[PDB]
Amino acid sequence: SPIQTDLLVAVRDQGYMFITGPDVIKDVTGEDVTFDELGGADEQAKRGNIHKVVNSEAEAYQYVRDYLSFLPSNHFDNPPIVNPGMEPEITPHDLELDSIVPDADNMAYDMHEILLRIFDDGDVFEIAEQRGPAMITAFARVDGHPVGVIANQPMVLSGAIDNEASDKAASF
Amino acid sequence: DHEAHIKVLRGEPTPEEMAALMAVLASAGGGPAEPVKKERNMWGHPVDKLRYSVFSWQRVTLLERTHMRR
Amino acid sequence: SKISKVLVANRGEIAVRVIRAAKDAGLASVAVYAEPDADAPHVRLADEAFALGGQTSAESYLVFEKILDAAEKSGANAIHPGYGFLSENADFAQAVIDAGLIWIGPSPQSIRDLGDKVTARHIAARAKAPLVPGTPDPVKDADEVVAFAKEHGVPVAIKAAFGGGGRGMKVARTLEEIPELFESATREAIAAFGRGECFVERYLDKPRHVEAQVIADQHGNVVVAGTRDCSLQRRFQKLVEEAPAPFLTDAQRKEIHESAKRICKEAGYYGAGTVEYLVGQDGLISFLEVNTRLQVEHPVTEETSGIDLVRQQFKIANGEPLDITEDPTPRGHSFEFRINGEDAGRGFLPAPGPVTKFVAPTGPGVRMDSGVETGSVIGGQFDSMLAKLIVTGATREEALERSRRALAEFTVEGLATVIPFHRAVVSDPAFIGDGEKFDVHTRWIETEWNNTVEPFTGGDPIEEEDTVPRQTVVVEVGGRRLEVSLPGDLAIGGGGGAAAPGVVRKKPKPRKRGGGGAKAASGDAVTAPMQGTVVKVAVEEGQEVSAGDLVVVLEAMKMENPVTAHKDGTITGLAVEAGAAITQGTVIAEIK
Numbered sequence A: 001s002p003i004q005t006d007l008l009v010a011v012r013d014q015g016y017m018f019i020t021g022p023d024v025i026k027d028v029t030g031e032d033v034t035f036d037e038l039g040g041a042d043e044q045a046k047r048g049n050i051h052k053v054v055n056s057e058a059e060a061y062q063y064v065r066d067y068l069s070f071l072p073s074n075h076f077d078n079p080p081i082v083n084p085g086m087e088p089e090i091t092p093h094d095l096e097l098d099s100i101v102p103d104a105d106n107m108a109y110d111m112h113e114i115l116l117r118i119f120d121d122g123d124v125f126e127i128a129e130q131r132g133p134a135m136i137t138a139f140a141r142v143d144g145h146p147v148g149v150i151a152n153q154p155m156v157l158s159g160a161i162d163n164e165a166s167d168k169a170a171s172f
Numbered sequence B: 001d002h003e004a005h006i007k008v009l010r011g012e013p014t015p016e017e018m019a020a021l022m023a024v025l026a027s028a029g030g031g032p033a034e035p036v037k038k039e040r041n042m043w044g045h046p047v048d049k050l051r052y053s054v055f056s057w058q059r060v061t062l063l064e065r066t067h068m069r070r
Numbered sequence C: 001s002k003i004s005k006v007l008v009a010n011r012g013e014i015a016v017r018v019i020r021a022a023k024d025a026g027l028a029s030v031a032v033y034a035e036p037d038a039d040a041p042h043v044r045l046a047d048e049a050f051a052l053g054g055q056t057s058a059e060s061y062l063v064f065e066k067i068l069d070a071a072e073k074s075g076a077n078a079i080h081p082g083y084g085f086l087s088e089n090a091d092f093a094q095a096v097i098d099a100g101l102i103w104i105g106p107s108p109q110s111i112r113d114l115g116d117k118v119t120a121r122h123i124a125a126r127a128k129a130p131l132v133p134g135t136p137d138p139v140k141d142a143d144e145v146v147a148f149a150k151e152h153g154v155p156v157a158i159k160a161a162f163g164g165g166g167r168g169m170k171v172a173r174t175l176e177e178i179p180e181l182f183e184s185a186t187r188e189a190i191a192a193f194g195r196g197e198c199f200v201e202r203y204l205d206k207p208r209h210v211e212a213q214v215i216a217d218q219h220g221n222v223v224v225a226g227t228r229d230c231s232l233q234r235r236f237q238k239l240v241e242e243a244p245a246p247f248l249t250d251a252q253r254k255e256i257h258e259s260a261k262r263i264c265k266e267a268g269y270y271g272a273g274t275v276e277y278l279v280g281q282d283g284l285i286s287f288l289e290v291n292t293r294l295q296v297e298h299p300v301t302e303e304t305s306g307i308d309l310v311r312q313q314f315k316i317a318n319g320e321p322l323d324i325t326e327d328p329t330p331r332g333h334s335f336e337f338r339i340n341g342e343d344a345g346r347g348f349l350p351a352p353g354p355v356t357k358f359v360a361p362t363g364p365g366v367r368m369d370s371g372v373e374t375g376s377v378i379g380g381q382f383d384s385m386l387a388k389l390i391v392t393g394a395t396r397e398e399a400l401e402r403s404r405r406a407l408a409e410f411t412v413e414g415l416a417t418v419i420p421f422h423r424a425v426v427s428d429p430a431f432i433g434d435g436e437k438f439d440v441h442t443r444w445i446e447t448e449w450n451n452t453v454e455p456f457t458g459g460d461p462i463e464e465e466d467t468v469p470r471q472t473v474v475v476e477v478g479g480r481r482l483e484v485s486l487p488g489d490l491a492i493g494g495g496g497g498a499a500a501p502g503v504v505r506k507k508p509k510p511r512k513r514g515g516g517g518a519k520a521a522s523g524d525a526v527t528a529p530m531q532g533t534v535v536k537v538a539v540e541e542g543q544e545v546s547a548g549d550l551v552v553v554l555e556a557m558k559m560e561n562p563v564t565a566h567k568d569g570t571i572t573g574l575a576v577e578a579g580a581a582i583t584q585g586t587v588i589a590e591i592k
């Protein structure tokens, strides 16, 4: 049932996910494996089965509230509009972007330095941060309107699109 | 308190002048200003007057969505 | 030979100043600009301009070949270095002279002699200037420093023999700190200046900084244009300066004047320069150093004595004798305030940004020497100064009143500045004084001033109410003019409204990292926290490091910022070398 849902948020050392347990695995195939290896929160996040790993259930609830604040109630309704019309003229934050990209081609940089300046504010809400770290999938707002953001992350593996990055982008 | 208030950026009015200014502004207020009373009435909506190809994707993305938005 | 065309080997307000002086004198002006200064005011003000190229100072303005090639291609026959950069480089002065050009400044030998602080102390002692007790030669080991400190009693100070800019001085309160402080000073001097030599002297508890402007002649004449007080310092760099030096006995004033003349004559100094002293709370004067260039503070002396010091430099370089035969009598009192791009609400940390608005005061007794204008951009490469505001009056009180007015008028937007601090100090009682003394000193700002300045935020909306659009309208209520700011969703008189269709308002989030507790530990990358230039790489590929260990040093606004490891592990993927320009968010290395 969970795998069919759109978002999966797990508590770090408390939530696990696996078809078969390590004892049954040992009985049938003889392999020795712990829970963390066989479906810890972070392992599943890196494999893509989990979208978010938190440290506590309160953090999970807050992540859910933030996630829902970008979305409509259903396929037909409109999403909430939050703080429309801020800063309608070029700002120093906009002018910082003219010199953000490194001069040399081989240099990596953090794409968040651009994502935190090209939208309404620093409310870039990232989803599945761990799955494909070369790709960034997030929510943001343009003039108060939610938008999805698919960005490359040069800071990680030169921003090359790998298997997990491709699937993360497609699902998003 | 996070309400957006009226600011007198420059000048220092006396209480009588402030009273006069606020009275004039309140009178100039916009009245009901688009109340929530609006009711839905889809009778004769333009989307229903359009010809749609029997396989038009706009039957989903324009017609169905217009009839379903709330 | 006589100056016919002057190349100003500098930038900003000083470049504009020298260009204006040359225009007054009737000479032609050549400007040299780096790529970041492609449209600075001096470039357009000069008769002609040449592009040195490059972005950093170390590759544009500090290159003898580039400056001399600009001189050759422009046909200039004199070079004026301004201040900073090469203005105190004896080798550059010698190269300029060898190229057959008129070096507008002191001789290379004078520069070397007065730059070597121990040699400077020897010259001062020979000239019989007042000196604070201290070892006349560099110490050998911490034992010598401890012997001096035990003899003379703490407090004490250890100073590098070639240090400058306020970095080369360290302080010892107790005998226990002497060895570690000496070792630290030695290593810092070795790293920064090459000459790993230092000496020790007594440390004044709350000194005043008093200096004398000297016009010196190639024919041996010397005149003291007047004194200045620059006690208001931030990091051993001045912020507010006065002329003449206030609240000094005639004995002190005469001693400063005479010792300055004697020092210049002993050193063989010619051209404009300054002699800097220290006045302790006990009233004793001590010789501190000699600046061998036109000093940033010269405008106050110009205003109070009526001397054009840049044109005096031109005349001395042309070799004529001084037209001034006796020390001028000061008239009035002048204050100078530096408009730095520094935020007083953030520890005076400089930051770049656009100058979206720059409206300087005018009117009685106000002079503005600015290298900035509306639409200019301050990058991360060069010093943080934007302009200098000079306010003059018939007396100190009138000057202070005019300063209050002018600072109230002065407006700058787009980036932070020290105008809020100037506005506060010009009315702080500790600076006004009691008519016979005043309480400030060289460490007053950082340790005694009540810092009430709020951090700069610009127009960024921070609170929920800041998001609401507003419109400002002029109203009149019985004649009285008012400016009223009205929100776009205001509801008054039982009516009104806007943004009905499902609009929500909440506190906007800062354009900063998500604020996770990991403090960037979620990744392996070390990222440059600001735009700057890598000046030192403290690690090497494959080097294992621990959290807090230094990784690189980034220079921004000519100030150094260390970037340190955020996690333990092996340094890998080093992508930076000394001298490389780096942008914010650039990956320096990965601690894997």
Ligand SMILES: Nc1ncnc2c1ncn2[C@@H]1O[C@H](COP(=O)(O)OP(=O)(O)OP(=O)(O)O)[C@@H](O)[C@H]1O
Pocket (backbone or CB within 6 Å): C132, C157, C163, C164, C165, C166, C167, C169, C201, C202, C203, C204, C205, C207, C209, C233, C236, C276, C278, C288, C289, C291, C442
């Ligand atoms: N012996 C001392 N006792 C107390 N304070 C001192 C002493 N020596 C220096 N200082 C303080 O430290 C500052 C250091 O100034 P100093 O002229 O020595 O360096 P600088 O301006 O960096 O040099 P330069 O002009 O040669 O580049 C002095 O202005 C004064 O504020």
Ligand SMILES: *C(=O)CCCC[C@@H]1SC[C@@H]2NC(=O)N[C@@H]21
Pocket (backbone or CB within 6 Å): C083, C084, C085, C237, C238, C296, C382, C383, C384
């Ligand atoms: C680049 O900006 C050159 C240095 C400009 C500042 C110079 S440094 C030495 C002088 N002392 C000071 O406080 N400003 C001057």
Ligand SMILES: [Mg+2]
Pocket (backbone or CB within 6 Å): C276, C289, C291
């Ligand atoms: Mg000095």
